[PDB]
Design a protein around this ligand. Structure first.
Ligand code: NAI
Ligand code: NAI
Ligand code: NAI
Ligand code: NAI
Ligand code: YCP
Ligand code: YCP
Ligand code: YCP
Ligand code: YCP
Lengths: 277, 277, 279, 278
């Protein structure tokens, strides 16, 4: 309750998490501060109306915060760590949200200034903004047991959250981190299919999104295999099995596997370049 | 509250709706009766444990019911209507859930026995079982205004529900009716992609489903275009835009359009055969 | 009982051989209580039937007079000529079992009813694995088949594999799945063997391992209540070799090709029978 | 062999499958079997419990209980396991590695640091051992005695086909019969969807497709004829089956199965190459 939260970066992810946290009630907007070198951002304007404290100065965010989220682009992380490293205290829990960036790389930058930085790495996604996020976290070398439990409590307020080994996170990034983009592409296309068959666009968007929401919820609430739930939809000779055939004829399943793989491979490739630098 | 509901048919759709209605609290299990010529069905066993009254005799379902759902396969509908047509009373609201079957065809069969049958046609989907269904309905020639409002009240308890013109329903069937099957295929494949990149299968299923649920919820709660929400996920040069490219290279969008179209075309084709018979 | 039943095959080809070998291997019938007829004795199937001890004759009337249960095992377009030829020889005691793809009970009963009013007709679809008593058989009973006729036919065909009664309107689809099925399987086993050879296995070992793998997986599914996707999930470890191989199957639309096959077989069956009904 | 104690290090899919097959075969009483795992909250551990298999978290307990010791852990866990119990391997032990890709030489090098001449056998099997129709190959290590191989072949023949091979074939066998059940399950799911599309109930389509594949596989195993000849026997000229074969050929059906065996084998070799660099 006395917990103060800070965001280095004031972009899409910082907005989504601050919106989710405040809607969840687990944090008052006034306990949150975010910093950015650009206050002319739509997300900065939104955070202001929410009641989040804003500043150009990353040092002010550090000084206000107990839990410090790093919500900048991955290549900005080392610059950020050099800038505020001398201002980290024993009270701080540093939570990196950046795609690809390793706990090792973060702990090495911070340890030059003060031993035993408490670091947690997470991967989440934009649906935390409607409290339906998918989040994983890995705890660092000096994180205490209460640090992981605190972070799971906080991130569970805005969706699914579980601890993982760090070597799983790049793959999670390709699945649930990039996942919403696959869904939005799919929903746009399903709506176009509805329009082609005679539905108004607004209705098609609503129906397609509601269908995907409900099916996903069924699977999360069921112990059955997704193929069994699929079997339950189709009648023999019917419309649904005819539609499933044309998906299969296009290699639909393989394209989704291709996407998760391509995201994960790019994440690893980018971090290799960072480590080489 | 005094309303009694009956299901002709005791299969996947009847279970899903009865489960959703009772979980919603809008109906007590004991106000529901369902009939089937086969009590050795898993769905019949499930309905029994819920507290739903079961019978082999469709006439008993009619006699108990105020609202009567037709939840049999489309080709069974005319047989069903011939069987119980003499038992429909002025109190009855007949709600056909059957894919493709027209209000005209139903009103013609029932009108031979008694004038002015009150008929509503709906299309829904299995996620009503977790109260996240997508339902549309069209009112028949003799349905009263309170009949449509009653049905929207009832079906809104288990998900989205809106009135449509009947000529939209076959297209809705290809989008949200068959939709859950597209989602389950997609979730199975996304999980395989997670497994390929090193995630345990149970975790990949959970993450993929949670990602699709959250993205769908974002779109339902946003006024923004799905392409804008997609743009918000990707950073320049990043993992997500790399993954979106490989989806595009496979014609991912076109496959989903193909599916909605194929389902809708099959539905129309099947009903043409029924009308020819 | 069963060994006292006389069985006849009109047609002495691949299906008659497969069934006669299955029945005799099962011990339900003595080979010499089977008679088969063909206008062509220079077939390999006739020679094999002869070596088993089946009675062979060129005269379909002899097969009819010999038999109690009479299997029609000729090509579908031959059935109406067969029915014209021996229809007058069908007796009240006969059970007539059509194995021909596509041919309807109605077409058979219309021919035979011109001779006697209540011909007992059963239609079945089976497959060549009856030869190792692992066939997949369905049957539908005709207008005049007694309840005991269906029970007898199920007992007989269960001796050489799986057997269940179905409505007749399912049989063309069954034909595209389990009737044509063994050919899809032999194609797949030939290709899996080539895959083993490409990766360095001797052909003989690759053939045996591929066939054992498919047999064991199919038996697993038949003995499990789990979805095939779940059994599939259990084979793969994260990042491992099996999931990499499943991806390249998916990239080629592997699933859609098998759906295409069942559909193509069933559509061709319906199309041929429509030409027969037109003729 | 009633004087034989079998142990599993690992209590996952493969250990369950083998234990269920051995016990169903009657060659082992379930109480003569011990399995270890650091995680007792697995579905496979509960199933092993109900069978009457002894469970323990301690790999050393499994080693002390067992004469034949199956390594049923993921390949990257093998070197850790060997470090943990290498000092407990006795002369009596036969160590049977089931792990994909892991070489006899790598196992022998680990165990030899503790006691010379470890008796090592490498095998590749598959999950259908659970219905006693597995396909297993094995290779004997440097110090395996002649009777060690014969004993293993007797034990593994009780749950399916089993033959000795040169070790350099095992990665390819892994891509064919090791991964093979997954190809079949994919095919059976798809064939069932095909049956449903043409009007069959799903339960019936699943049963018929599985029976068709089982019977055709048995036909081939029992026949001296080429699979092409058995295929030819199914088709009549102009008929339904040859029409269906054509659409398989037009999609390169054969090439996809070759692709799968190749992709599995290449990945196995790639993974072990990384293990050997580490
Ligand atoms: N957008 C998404 O869907 C998700 C993004 N992420 C991660 O979140 C991090 C940020 O992602 P987005 O918010 O999408 O980026 P974004 O580009 O919307 O916001 C980036 C923010 O960093 C600020 N910034 C740049 N230099 C700075 C500095 N020196 N000090 C402080 N702030 C600075 C920018 O002004 C902007 O406010 C990335 O590492 C990304 O991998 C992870 C999960 C999902
Ligand atoms: N499964 C789905 O996803 C949805 C299905 N529907 C529609 O719901 C209707 C039923 O669909 P499912 O429940 O999936 O079918 P289902 O096959 O699971 O259940 C069909 C039920 O009808 C019963 N039945 C057969 N003959 C009968 C008779 N003479 N009298 C009474 N009951 C009889 C069967 O025994 C079975 O209980 C279909 O028209 C379908 O289009 C619509 C929305 C979604
Ligand atoms: N081969 C298979 O895998 C299966 C075939 N079937 C059905 O079995 C029937 C026969 O198929 P196959 O045995 O494969 O054909 P096949 O061509 O091997 O043998 C056909 C037999 O009919 C004989 N025949 C031709 N004219 C005749 C006549 N007037 N009187 C008597 N016999 C005559 C031929 O000489 C030959 O012995 C077909 O209707 C086919 O659909 C059904 C299930 C599987
Ligand atoms: N599943 C299959 O279809 C086949 C698997 N294999 C091989 O069998 C081995 C196991 O495969 P699955 O059983 O499928 O894996 P699985 O993941 O189902 O079970 C793995 C087991 O290892 C246990 N484990 C992890 N660390 C351990 C440790 N330090 N000490 C003891 N147990 C530990 C886990 O708790 C789990 O019980 C792999 O090397 C695989 O290549 C070979 C043939 C077929
Ligand atoms: O495949 C079918 O016959 C049905 C039609 C309606 C929505 C669900 N699936
Ligand atoms: O495209 C990107 O850079 C990020 C990576 C992490 C998840 C969201 N998208
Ligand atoms: O996918 C895997 O890791 C294993 C390899 C061995 C055979 C079965 N599947
Ligand atoms: O190709 C054919 O004509 C037959 C039809 C029946 C099943 C087996 N093959």
């Amino acid at each position: 309750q006395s917990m103060s939260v800070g965001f280095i970066g004031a972009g899409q992810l910082a907005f989504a998490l601050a919106k989710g946290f405040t809607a969840a009630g687990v944090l008052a907007a006034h306990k949150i501060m975010a910093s950015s070198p650009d206050m002319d951002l739509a997300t900065v304007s939104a955070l202001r109306k929410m009641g989040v404290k804003l500043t150009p100065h990353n040092k002010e965010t550090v000084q206000h915060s107990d839990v410090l989220f790093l919500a900048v682009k991955p290549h900005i992380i080392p610059f950020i760590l050099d800038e505020i490293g001398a201002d980290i205290e024993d009270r701080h829990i540093v939570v990196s949200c950046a795609a690809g960036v390793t706990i090792s790389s973060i702990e090495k930058k911070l340890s030059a200034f003060r031993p035993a930085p408490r670091v947690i790495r997470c991967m989440t996604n934009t649906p935390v903004v409607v409290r339906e996020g998918a989040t994983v976290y890995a705890t660092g070398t000096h994180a205490q047991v209460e640090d992981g439990r605190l972070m799971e409590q906080l991130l569970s307020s805005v969706g699914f959250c579980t601890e993982v080994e760090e070597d799983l996170i790049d793959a999670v990034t390709g699945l649930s981190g990039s996942g919403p983009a696959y869904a939005f592409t799919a929903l746009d296309a399903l709506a176009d299919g509805g329009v082609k068959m005679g539905l108004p666009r607004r209705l098609a968007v609503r129906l397609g999104a509601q269908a995907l929401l409900g099916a996903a919820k069924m699977l999360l609430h069921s112990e059955q295999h997704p193929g069994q739930l699929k079997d339950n939809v189709s009648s023999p000779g019917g419309a649904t099995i005819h539609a499933l055939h044309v998906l299969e004829s296009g290699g639909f399943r393989s394209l989704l596997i291709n996407a998760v793989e391509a995201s994960c491979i790019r994440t690893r490739e980018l971090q290799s370049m960072a480590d080489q630098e």
